[PDB]
Amino acid sequence: DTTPRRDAEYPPPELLEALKPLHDICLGKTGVTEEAIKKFSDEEIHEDEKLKCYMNCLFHEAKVVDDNGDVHLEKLHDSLPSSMHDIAMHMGKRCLYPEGETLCDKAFWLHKCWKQSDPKHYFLV
Amino acid sequence: DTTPRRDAEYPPPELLEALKPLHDICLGKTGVTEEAIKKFSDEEIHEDEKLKCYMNCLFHEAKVVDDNGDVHLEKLHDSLPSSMHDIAMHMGKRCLYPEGETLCDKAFWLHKCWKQSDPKHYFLV
Numbered sequence: 001d002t003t004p005r006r007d008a009e010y011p012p013p014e015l016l017e018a019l020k021p022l023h024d025i026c027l028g029k030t031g032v033t034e035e036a037i038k039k040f041s042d043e044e045i046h047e048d049e050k051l052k053c054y055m056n057c058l059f060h061e062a063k064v065v066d067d068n069g070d071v072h073l074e075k076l077h078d079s080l081p082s083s084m085h086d087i088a089m090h091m092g093k094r095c096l097y098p099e100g101e102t103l104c105d106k107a108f109w110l111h112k113c114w115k116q117s118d119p120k121h122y123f124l125v
Numbered sequence: 126d127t128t129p130r131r132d133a134e135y136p137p138p139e140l141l142e143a144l145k146p147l148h149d150i151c152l153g154k155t156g157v158t159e160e161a162i163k164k165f166s167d168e169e170i171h172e173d174e175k176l177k178c179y180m181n182c183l184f185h186e187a188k189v190v191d192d193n194g195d196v197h198l199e200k201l202h203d204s205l206p207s208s209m210h211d212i213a214m215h216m217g218k219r220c221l222y223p224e225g226e227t228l229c230d231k232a233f234w235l236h237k238c239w240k241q242s243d244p245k246h247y248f249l250v
């Protein structure tokens with residue numbers, strides 16, 4: 001099955017709360033639209049360049065990047081609620097090695113790969 | 126101290142059989158001893174420079190490396206029998222980004238991290 005899980009327990013409401021100020025910072029800096037984000041989260045993969053840089057910005061603001069700004073997958077996994085540790089592991093297991101010229105492209109590569117792997121449990125806010 | 130699982134079903138006999146010719150090539154190329162391998166497999170983590178190179182050689186002969194000889198963890202996971210996939214997921218989750226000067230150092234880093242993470246299921250042949 002592929003239709004997104006959205007209910008009282010998933011995505012973890014406390015993670016969603018935590019991401020709010022990061023969303024404000026990153027949406028403001030990038031100029032992506034709230035709709036672009038929700039369409040990527042809940043509907044079809046699409047290509048929006050400002051959305052790619054929003055994705056990058058989130059990783060930086062969440063402090064899950066290395067000294068080159070590349071996503072550190074252990075840091076990221078560890079930053080998630082324990083309730084989604086298994087789902088996250090399987091979502092990411094064929095998305096270890098991002099490709100792309102810029103950080104925005106690599107950020108996008110990761111989000112696209114996750115959503116392809118587990119569309120039901122993938123979300124973006 | 127947790128006991129390595131060694132019985133009729135684990136490590137998977139078919140994998141053990143398949144790896145015999147790789148063991149022969151790599152021991153011949155690196156000059157590691159049979160005893161060094163078995164002791165790393167079943168007893169204490171230990172430092173042996175030829176053993177580190179044997180470990181690198183196995184990755185190479187198993188064709189689970191990238192163009193520069195570094196371990197590609199997806200190719201590796203995919204090379205294992207399905208019976209081992211879950212075990213490998215958890216064994217390797219803290220072990221994504223090997224450190225070390227040489228390919229042999231990085232191969233050793235991975236084997237040590239795996240054996241540290243799950244000494245029950247870790248083996249080396």
Ligand SMILES: CC[C@@H](C)OC(=O)N1CCCC[C@H]1CCO
Pocket residue numbers: 073074076077088089090091092093094096114218219221
């Ligand atoms: C969005 C999913 C992302 C956080 O992925 C992971 O949970 N990964 C990456 C893939 C290997 C397993 C695990 C690494 C944990 O150390």
Ligand SMILES: CC[C@@H](C)OC(=O)N1CCCC[C@H]1CCO
Pocket residue numbers: 019058059060062064076079080123124125
């Ligand atoms: C938790 C830190 C943040 C940078 O990680 C994420 O970008 N995630 C976490 C869940 C996987 C997709 C994505 C959605 C977030 O809106």
Ligand SMILES: CC[C@@H](C)OC(=O)N1CCCC[C@H]1CCO
Pocket residue numbers: 089093094096198199201202213214215216217218219220239
């Ligand atoms: C001996 C373990 C090795 C074969 O596998 C892994 O380290 N994997 C599986 C490949 C995806 C990344 C990682 C899972 C991290 O949680």
Ligand SMILES: CC[C@@H](C)OC(=O)N1CCCC[C@H]1CCO
Pocket residue numbers: 144183184187189204205247248249250
């Ligand atoms: C199957 C390809 C081969 C290069 O993988 C390994 O070297 N493994 C995988 C089994 C756990 C660790 C190690 C021991 C095997 O001698």
Ligand SMILES: [Mg+2]
Pocket residue numbers: 226227
């Ligand atoms: Mg040295």
